Amino acid sequence: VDYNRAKWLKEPNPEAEELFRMVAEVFIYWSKSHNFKREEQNFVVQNEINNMSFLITDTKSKMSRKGDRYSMQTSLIVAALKRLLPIGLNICAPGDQELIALAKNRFSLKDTEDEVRDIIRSNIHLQGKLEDPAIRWQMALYKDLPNRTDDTSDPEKTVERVLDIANVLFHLEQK
Amino acid sequence: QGWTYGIQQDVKNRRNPRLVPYTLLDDRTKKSNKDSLREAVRTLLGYGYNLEAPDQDHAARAEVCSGTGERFRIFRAEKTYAVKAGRWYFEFETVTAGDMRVGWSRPGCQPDQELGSDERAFAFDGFKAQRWHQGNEHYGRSWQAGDVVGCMVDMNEHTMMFTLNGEILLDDSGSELAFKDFDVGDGFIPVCSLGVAQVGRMNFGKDVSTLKYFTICGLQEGYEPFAVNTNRDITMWLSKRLPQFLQVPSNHEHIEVTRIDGTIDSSPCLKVTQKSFGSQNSNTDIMFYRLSMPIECAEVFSKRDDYDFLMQTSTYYYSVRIFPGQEPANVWVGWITSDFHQYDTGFDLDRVRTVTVTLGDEKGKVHESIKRSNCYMVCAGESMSPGQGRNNNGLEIGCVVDAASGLLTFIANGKELSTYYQVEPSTKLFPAVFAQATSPNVFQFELGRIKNVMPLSAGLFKSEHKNPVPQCPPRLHVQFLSHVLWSRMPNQFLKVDVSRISERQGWLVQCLDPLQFMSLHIPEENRSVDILELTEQEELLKFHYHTLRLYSAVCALGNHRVAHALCSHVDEPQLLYAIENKYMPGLLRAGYYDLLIDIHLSSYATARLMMNNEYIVPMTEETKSITLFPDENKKHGLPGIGLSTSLRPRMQFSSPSFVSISNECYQYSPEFPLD
Amino acid sequence: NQHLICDNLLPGRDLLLQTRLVNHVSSMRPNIFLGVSEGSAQYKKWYYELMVDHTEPFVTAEATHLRVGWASTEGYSPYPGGGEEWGGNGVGDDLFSYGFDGLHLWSGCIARTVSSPNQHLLRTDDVISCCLDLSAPSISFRINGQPVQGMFENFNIDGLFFPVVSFSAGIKVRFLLGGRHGEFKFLPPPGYAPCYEAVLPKEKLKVEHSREYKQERTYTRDLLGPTVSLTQAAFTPIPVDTSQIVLPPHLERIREKLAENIHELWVMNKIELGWQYGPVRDDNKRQHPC
Amino acid sequence: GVEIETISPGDGRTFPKKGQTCVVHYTGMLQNGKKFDSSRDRNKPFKFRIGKQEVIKGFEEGAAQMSLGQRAKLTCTPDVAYGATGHPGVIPPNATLIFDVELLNLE
């Protein structure tokens, strides 16, 4: 992905984009099961994983005691989520940014993802102000993408994906 | 033999192109000599003598070949653009690769200090891949030529981030935060420091499309370009190359100035002491001091004590007492002009800037020669000359200036020194001392007087022009040459077109579009700055605003004579420039708007507002033609538009001219272009 | 009170800050650096011309600024020394520059009126000849081929000199540096070399801004740090001394063989590439009696 | 009394006659170089009639000695200027005046 993220960003690839949702599903499973941390501390000692051989090796390809020397940031799952969030974020629109915003807001309010779906579907009709210079220059910079509009994007499945990514960010940053 | 270098070879003038450094020499002669050289060295090797090199060395010259006083230049945004909240982004393109730093600086950041060497700035240095804030750590990687560094600040969460070509830089750990925590303070502004032979560019994102990696990293994280919500170019400030004289700060690390009152048996003294002497990092470099007010020579030169002589004389005196323990050879005493800006570690009296203007008659026959300089000083060491006991008294060098004749003389100890100077009329001379500290007590300005010579305070102050008693008013103080100053880069430059018309016609330089700036002149210091520089000089801004308020007050309520007088000091081009300029400070803008209104419009505006509530409508056919509604459709017309016939005060103005002697122009307000 | 305060404060112009509109002044110089030093290969006398195609005496209410002359640097630095870089000041407004404005010689921000046949300020179709002699420090001017009865001398020569013109808006001027960069309208004084001869062989002659910053876009403006001193401006050849060193005898009687071998090298070389005997000395005939 | 130096030559032939009006552009400076008056600042040429004590007589005689179309610098001593009393609020006592005067027209 680090070799081909720029190709996927300059030219969006919907077929390759599904990987973002897929690894996000992997991440929510990582959130679900608490046993990964203990078994991973065991797996790292049993078979020697330092994540450094992947952390400091990727720079050449991209051409751009134990307790103290050992950290968890080299984990493959979290590395993958950092390296794969931007493609999904680029799938997300500046208009969809507000949708993600109130999805994260309701996640913080601890409303279940089932209830927020209908609420967001109803609030879709209430579009934002259009003449304001800020939002006007965001879609001025966003209009380069031909078929990334909400008119072509299916409403309900994109709303469900917005709730999913809002939960992803919710857990990742503030839990 | 006498030959010199020339672009073309000439036997008669002994010019050749080969007299160039071997690095720049052409290959043809180079290889012509090198073939025989190679044959000779190979023959040496062949005949049985083997030659080995002495050694191979790997040393760096540090490319510090620039001026010794300038190792780097700091370019920053204006202080008024400090951000105290929100998310901000800007870019720094590195045309070259070298000793360059980029980041956010506090408004108090000093231009003569490295970025991040103190607490006043947070910087990233890609030359050594480091982060700089009150110390040095390791952060990120090293850029190359053409790399763009995106700097992000989040003042809500108190974080800073740096990206190289869109990739987030990392510290020793995996943290993306360049600086985890910091107080808001007065805010932060974009800043960069460029070293010797380094070229950069800072983009504030006024045109978002011009940003390179903002979309890759910064568009979607909530970071705003630093100039997105601006309709005007961000003013640039940068380190001042030319040092200027300014009052010694009370918190200076090295210099302390003590004001000594003048008793009946003594004279006022301004003593300079090196408070840091005898300790770590004591400043042993020569330092240049001067008095804040100059002595001005006469405009035209004529071709115990006596009170009448003192009253009729134009000769002023001061003295400098080099204390015991300070070597006289390291102290220079004399006068300087406002043109002196030469800060050099090694100062000698033979290296001062000088010129001679020679004017002659039609066929040669030089009839006058004028020596012009900015440093008329003598050396205390050569004033001492034979080695003295150095304990009898402090070495008291007395400087005497005759303004009526422009003569500068010196007294070593009751004896007139051989060195003397002659200055051109209207010259302003600042009493100056150049000293290298070899003791905690360096010297003191003694402002007394000697027989038949008027005190210095008299020539300094017009009020005390006839007061033989020496005085040291608070305006007079000690200033020192320093580099802690900023320069304001103009927002617009002259559009100059340079081209090569042809071989015969030479090089064409053309300039047609006028450009003007509004200059503020400091009378005592004899220096002029741009009035737009007052955005960062608070005391001058406040004093000038109150001066404009006084200008309004003196002509308030129909003082036409005072308004005419004020038209000499603030003319209508100045008023128009002040009201139209967009970068002018708000206080000065309001003051100048009020000044314009009070000088040129207030009287007639008040007269009309006074006849406002009275309606004397004469009867004419014009009055008869007036109707309530413009047409049958009874809709109100635009207010003010229409035919009004009511009597109103006459509008009359007088031309402000100071060559006329009519005295009748003092009625009515001065004219102004109303259209 | 109003009259008293006005009459006792305003006319002095010595306490309150003074305001005035000043025309912006810009300077142009060729990329030429002239210096004099012991052991240097630089010529000492130089000459150039500036000819004014057009000028407007009053573009604004302030008089048009136009001065021409020579400016020095602050100790081998490429920067024009001792002057501001934004505007307002031109040639002769500091002690590092020496200018002429058609009526006055300007130096140290001080002007001296100078005599000339039919004195007038610089105007259209005026040819100015500037001469700089560094052997005896002297700067001289000639207006329209007529001598100007004023002269600069005994100035500091520890820096590098260059032609310079300072101006406000409303001019068209043309540098004539001789040769292929503008033919001189007048014959230079004897012993004075045209300014185009000072170009180093690798570089190309140009006329550019005296200061680093000009009118450009904000994001396209190049910010420059300090610049290295021009050591190449003065070429002083100092070789490694050979008087203190001693030739050993073995190196000497092998030097005999080396000298004979290299002499053979040159002679056989001139056989294969075509030298021969020549009765008369000529460069074109390419023959040597060696 | 007045000291005149030509900046730009005029026709050299037409001079202000008696009972005529001189239309000029003048910029007034004090001897220290500070500007106090300028008609070019106001964008309105200054018109004055010869011999009717309408201006300071130093300026009067200087413009009289001027020629048509000529530009000149005029130095006026206080005796031919405001003198010891001066001009209140503008010209200090005993001030020598320097004028840049261009004689535009004679009407």
Ligand SMILES: Nc1ncnc2c1ncn2[C@@H]1O[C@H](COP(=O)(O)OP(=O)(O)OP(=O)(O)O)[C@@H](O)[C@H]1O
């Ligand atoms: N006969 C020759 N054949 C080929 N090249 C020659 C001949 N004579 C001189 N040259 C070349 O022409 C130049 C003239 O140098 P020359 O040998 O006369 O010695 P010189 O008088 O010491 O001068 P220089 O110091 O320039 O070498 C040198 O570059 C030399 O190599």
